[PDB]
Amino acid sequence: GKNPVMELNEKRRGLKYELISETGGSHDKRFVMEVEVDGQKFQGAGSNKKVAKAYAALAALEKLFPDTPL
Numbered sequence: 001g002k003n004p005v006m007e008l009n010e011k012r013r014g015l016k017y018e019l020i021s022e023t024g025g026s027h028d029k030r031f032v033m034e035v036e037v038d039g040q041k042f043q044g045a046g047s048n049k050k051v052a053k054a055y056a057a058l059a060a061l062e063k064l065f066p067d068t069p070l
Contacts, residue, residue, distance in 0.1 A: 001068060001069040001070060002070065003054070004054045004055070004057035004058040004061060004070070005017075005053060005054060005057045007057070007061060007065075007068050007070075008035075008037070008057040008060055008061055008065070011061075011064070011065055011068075012037055015035055015036070015037065016035070016036070017033050017034070017035050017053050017056060017057075018033065018034050018035070019031065019032070019033055019049065019052075020032050020033065020034045020043070021045075029047060029048075030045060030046075030047065031045065031046055031047070031048065031049050031052040032044070032045045032052060033045075033049065033052040033053045033055070033056040034056060035053075035056045035057060035060055037060045037064060038064070040060075040063070040064075042056050042057075042059040042060040042063070043055075043056050043059065044056030044057070044058060044059055058070075
């Protein structure tokens with residue numbers, strides 16, 4: 001375990017990550033990603049899409065799979 005998207009995928013396959021926010025200039029960009037798991041929405045933010053997506057998965061894992069080793 002180490003990659004949030006990878007670990008969540010082990011619990012739920014075919015999840016779709018949606019970019020819901022992209023703001024700030026090329027020097028202060030902020031991305032917000034959202035993932036839906038069991039009708040529940042989880043979001044993650046960051047300076048780039050990859051980490052925003054990872055935080056979105058982490059949020060899902062922290063709620064639904066607390067024991068999953070990071």
